[PDB]
Design a protein around this ligand. Structure first.
Ligand code: HEM
Ligand code: Y01
Ligand code: Y01
Ligand code: Y01
Ligand code: Y01
Ligand code: Y01
Ligand code: Y01
Ligand code: GSH
Ligand code: GSH
Ligand code: GSH
Ligand code: GSH
Lengths: 591, 591
């Protein structure tokens, strides 16, 4: 009693996992599946008993008909039970085929749960962890839980149960010494298998690691084809690749040899047990203590026990690795940040459109605070701009306005309504934003510009395309609206991406339009046509913008200049030139 | 005789493949391995004969000692042959362990051959094919050839051979009707397996394709986390993912059910054959025509035949897919471009350093020729520049100078030496070039700036680092020279990349230094320090450059302006301003 209470709640949670909590018929499928597994374990003893009975009736003179009937019964059981390999039988195969429905339900439920829980985390969690490996953890976790349940319920517990049935049949119906032989032989076999597998796993993991390094050495060398052509180094690249190959062979040989040693040890143990049992059984049956078929029964029973026990090592490794992998996935599932939550849940009301700041500090980086009590306010229809010395402070201002991160000390309200207790669905309904640079994922134009809401209609979406004028390029595409777009599809322009963005935010029709402008190269005339479209979508809508151009500065109804989280200049475009602060110096460098 | 002559030369080439053409002992290993395979096929008949002999001596009254000796011999053969037919016995396992050396030689040779042949192709071939899939073809080809040889030599030919031995043993030593039963049963079994597998492969491939699509729908949705957070579409993303899951289940169920049907058909056929054989054998042995152990012999022989024949379907699929995959790899191996080759092989001599052009046209794009008879010449030490209206013509001029592509009509010589018959090793020895933007692959600084030649020494490479002044940033790294660098390693600056480039070309010490400048953002003072380093490495060296800045234009000793492959302006910086062509207009827009 050392490792008992730790595994209990985890095994209880997995016990909750396999049983469908609400499904009507799936639980019946589970019960009938376990019933078939039990009946197959019955067949594993009831076949060779009939074999002994056949050879007993044959070895003495018997009538033809009764012997024929029992032979038919024997070959019938050799059909219902598997011919060999604990599979290939009308009972185990029907168990597998009838089992395949519940695995679908289990996999779908667990994997959709983990997918929703990845989309519920906050932004700050994702920027820390490498996104290229969380995916692997989740996928391997789902495959791990289905594999672990399948293996450890249907191919390890039945085998050990069959060992126990075996020791009992021999002890109760044969001499005790036969039970001693089978017991000692199978216990020794299991102990040798366990020890050698836990020794061999080191070579296994070292081989895998070196394999992933050698393959990478090559993909990169071919991809940098241009550089290796430059520097006249083909022979050097080939030689270094050969060295990586040689090291990989030097590990793989060790792994394969260890496998052979394990296999030969197992075979020797079963052969030794078979020799002892066959000799002793022969001695009794030639001393008239037993019957002729008992030797045949013992031979076929040892072979029948050995055939599924041969695959014990790989089950042991796979249960170990999926167990630790489920532990990692379960750890990630319990991990949770969700900074934006309040149980009061008072959704936002839109009545004016006033954006007011009140003395808020902020530190997404630890220690270095990037906000010193900035405070301003706007009226409905007001257009604000934010330009100053280079820094991510304005971008963080937008992101904290969007309830990505949290205020540190202070509060920001919209229309005098505190944003702390508002549901985020209500907030992201009221707000809308064209970003830095949009990313358009692999789909057609039609649904991707329908993406602004679920209920987007066809007439509405062609109406919005006419509103923001993509239709010329859309007809310039081969099939038009059904054009496949993305990394799989066609490459587009950054101006086209901003056109997509203004289309989908038109479809959203937000209260306040936020903008975040990039340094994408475009001619000024088309840039200002896009600016006119943004001006008309923000017409009678309050607007906060970051800008980099002179017109995009001078359009401001309330400019603001900040650096390192503090307000330094304010007013308008003409007033700050007459003031001649850093605005006047920056304006000459924008020429 | 329809598909005989087509397979002959391919099978002859694979016959050349397995046999090592020069190795002394590997051929001996191959012969001893085939000898062990033959002896194992002998054991597969010699075991159950002894089983029948044991039960025959047991069923009559026999002395203890002789029976004990033959029982020991039987269990001994059950050790040498697999306890369970398959790879579980000393005769076969030693074959696998002793075989593992020749597979290393085969895999290393074929995969290094294909790697060298990918590095021998020209540049124009790579820009056409997607590089993201040639890699898959090569890797799967090498794994295909080793798998195909292993499967089709060691687990299909032996099984069919064992079937033939079986029909003969029964026909020659038993009644002819037993041979008829085993023949008809195994022929029917093979035909059913073949037909059902070739029917099932459709569901297999459809399941794989839908699987790769569903997974991709998810990785992209998580990666665009920011956009899906913007547009308030978590529930929509989850729902669309659930639809993809449901379609995937709707295919996977069909595949699994087809597998179950195949397995049950196989088991039913073997069970039916076993029933017919056991009944008829029982009738003869109760009519005194045979001996008691003949029933036992037939039962164990049918089980021994069935146990390896159960795995026929997956061998059939895997031989089919690796066969077509080896065909693809072999097609790619025979594919070859190698535009730069002449058997005369007259290497370049460097005596002056004069670069002369003589009336050459060029068309890397078909039809649209991008070179109209450009011709000029330089003296040793001359510095040339190439700036004009935007176009890839200058870049192609450098690339054709480097013997990437070919001249179309005309010739270009260096120092009056024709570059057509020069060996490319001689050319790339004499020439050196700093490129557009270098790529530095995953290694340390030390060998990556040693990369300019194989014989790079430690004192030389620290000397070159002192020469080009990276040493301050190198000590600014954590451990200094052993810093791991790349995508795995640290990110660096573009100026640092150009420093690496000037270091490795210093180490090369070429005749003519070519440069190709990018639009990387850098301050002018450090840019001109880098320019001074390039000026001193090209000091007393002829130089051809593309430029974008005023100083990088006015340094030219012989300027040249081209557009769409034709020469339009020439002279120097001052002369073309006085001429006032497109040079004067472009110079005002460079301000
Ligand atoms: C889903 C679980 C399984 C996996 C992942 C698996 C994996 C593999 C793989 C990758 C091979 C190719 C040969 C190799 O890699 O050396 C293979 C072959 C084989 N598997 Fe499985 N297998 C599984 C289930 C089973 C079961 C249940 C059995 C029967 C007890 C079995 C018996 C075999 C046999 C006899 C071979 C051929 C060995 C040879 O040709 O040398 N496998 N398996
Ligand atoms: C979930 C798993 C662990 C269930 C395992 C079930 C076994 C522990 C038991 C339950 C029913 C038992 C069977 C019940 C009846 C029979 C028939 C019996 O055949 C006879 O000839 C007995 C009657 C007689 O004396 O005539 C031989 C044992 C056997 C197969 C028993 C073998 C052991 C079995 C399979
Ligand atoms: C459903 C498909 C797969 C066909 C399955 C057929 C079997 C169920 C048949 C075929 C051969 C039959 C056997 C053929 C001959 C005999 C001898 C026969 O002997 C007598 O009738 C004794 C003399 C008498 O009383 O007339 C008893 C039935 C038996 C064992 C038969 C039992 C039923 C068997 C196994
Ligand atoms: C390494 C693994 C395979 C275990 C091997 C153990 C055997 C070497 C041992 C354990 C059980 C022993 C047997 C247990 C009981 C008996 C019965 C015993 O019988 C009598 O004493 C009288 C018999 C009679 O009068 O008929 C003779 C020794 C013998 C065969 C023993 C011989 C040696 C055996 C087979
Ligand atoms: C697949 C390729 C490599 C061909 C493989 C051929 C073997 C499968 C054959 C060839 C010769 C055969 C043997 C020829 C003669 C005998 C003796 C035969 O009887 C005896 O052992 C003694 C008989 C007597 O007393 O005369 C048992 C089968 C055996 C070993 C045969 C087993 C199968 C063998 C090895
Ligand atoms: C190498 C390691 C794995 C040990 C292997 C041991 C076997 C080779 C031994 C152990 C038991 C032995 C058997 C034990 C008893 C007998 C009875 C013995 O009967 C006699 O006739 C002997 C006495 C006499 O001469 O009258 C003949 C040898 C035999 C079969 C022995 C043959 C050799 C065996 C199988
Ligand atoms: C579906 C697959 C598994 C094929 C099944 C074929 C059987 C239904 C056939 C083929 C071989 C036939 C046997 C071939 C030869 C004989 C011996 C023949 O013997 C005699 O004529 C006299 C025997 C004597 O006097 O001892 C009786 C019929 C029988 C058993 C035949 C019965 C029907 C068999 C088993
Ligand atoms: N949460 C996703 C994860 C999907 C996933 O991880 N897919 C694999 C390919 S089958 C992958 O891209 N692995 C990440 C890697 O190892 O690069 C899911 O389970 O659907
Ligand atoms: N009999 C051995 C091996 C049985 C076997 O055939 N397993 C195969 C897999 S199908 C194996 O070990 N291959 C290497 C691996 O799985 O890593 C054991 O005790 O596990
Ligand atoms: N020629 C290389 C090719 C290596 C290769 O193709 N590796 C695989 C991974 S095992 C890869 O790059 N896959 C790319 C992909 O799947 O897109 C070799 O055989 O060593
Ligand atoms: N008995 C079946 C299957 C035998 C078997 O165990 N094969 C496994 C692979 S280890 C299988 O079919 N798995 C599914 C697959 O390979 O697609 C046959 O006729 O091939």
């Amino acid at each position: 009693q050392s490792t008992w209470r730790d595994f209990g709640r985890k095994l209880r949670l997995l016990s909750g996992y396999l049983w469908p909590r609400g499904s009507p018929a799936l639980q019946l499928v589970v019960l009938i599946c376990l019933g078939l597994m039990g009946l197959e374990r019955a067949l594993n003893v009831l076949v060779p008993i009939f074999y002994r009975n056949i050879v007993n009736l044959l070895t003495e003179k018997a009538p033809w008909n009764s012997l024929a009937w029992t032979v038919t019964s024997y070959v019938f059981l050799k059909f219902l039970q598997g011919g060999g390999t604990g599979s290939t039988g009308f009972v185990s195969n029907l168990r597998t085929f009838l089992w395949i429905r519940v695995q679908q339900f289990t996999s779908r439920r667990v994997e959709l749960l983990i997918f929703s829980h990845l989309h519920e985390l906050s932004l700050r969690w994702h920027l820390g962890r490498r996104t290229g490996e969380v995916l692997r953890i989740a996928d391997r976790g789902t495959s791990s839980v289905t594999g672990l349940l399948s293996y450890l319920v249907f191919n390890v517990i039945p085998t050990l149960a069959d060992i126990i049935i075996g020791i009992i049949y021999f002890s109760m119906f044969f001499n005790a010494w036969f039970g001693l032989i089978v017991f000692l032989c199978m216990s020794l076999y299991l102990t040798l298998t366990i020890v050698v597998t836990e020794w061999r796993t080191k070579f296994r993991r070292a081989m895998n690691t070196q394999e992933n390094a050698t393959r990478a050495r090559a993909v990169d060398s071919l991809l940098n084809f241009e550089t290796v052509k430059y520097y006249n180094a083909e022979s050097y690249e080939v030689e270094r690749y050969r060295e990586a190959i040689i090291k990989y062979q030097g590990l793989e040989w060790k792994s394969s040899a260890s496998l052979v040693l394990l296999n030969q040890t197992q075979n020797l143990v079963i052969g030794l047990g078979l020799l002892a049992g066959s000799l002793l059984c022969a001695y009794f049956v030639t001393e008239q203590k037993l019957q002729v078929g008992d030797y045949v029964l013992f031979g076929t029973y040892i072979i029948q026990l050995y055939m599924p026990l041969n695959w014990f090592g790989t089950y042991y490794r796979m249960i170990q690795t999926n167990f630790i992998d489920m532990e990692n996935m379960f750890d990630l599932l319990k991990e949770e940040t969700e900074v934006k939550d309040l149980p009061g849940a008072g959704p936002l009301r839109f009545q004016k459109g006033r954006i007011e700041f009140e003395n808020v500090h902020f530190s997404y980086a630890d220690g270095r605070e990037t906000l010193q009590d900035v405070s301003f306010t706007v009226m409905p229809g007001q257009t604000l701009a934010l330009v100053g010395p280079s820094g991510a402070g304005k971008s963080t201002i937008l992101r904290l306005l969007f309830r990505f991160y949290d205020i540190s000390s202070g509060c920001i309200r919209i229309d005098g309504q505190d944003i702390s207790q508002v549901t985020q669905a209500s907030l992201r309904s009221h707000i809308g934003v064209v970003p830095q640079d949009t990313v358009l994922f692999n789909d057609t134009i039609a649904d991707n510009i329908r993406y602004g809401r679920v209920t987007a209609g066809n007439d509405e979406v062609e109406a919005a395309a006419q509103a923001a004028g993509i239709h010329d390029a859309i007809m310039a595409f081969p099939e038009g609206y059904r054009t496949q777009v993305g990394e799989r599809g066609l490459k587009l322009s950054g101006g086209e991406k901003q056109r997509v963005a203004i289309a989908r935010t038109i479809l959203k029709a937000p209260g306040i339009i936020l903008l975040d402008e990039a340094t994408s190269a475009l001619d000024t005339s088309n840039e200002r046509a896009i600016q006119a479209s943004l001006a008309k979508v923000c017409a009678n809508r309050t607007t906060i913008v970051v800008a980099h151009r002179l017109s995009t500065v001078v359009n401001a109804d309330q400019i603001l200049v900040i650096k390192d989280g503090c307000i330094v200049e304010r007013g308008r475009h003409e007033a700050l030139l007459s003031r001649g602060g850093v605005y006047a110096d920056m304006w000459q460098l924008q020429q």
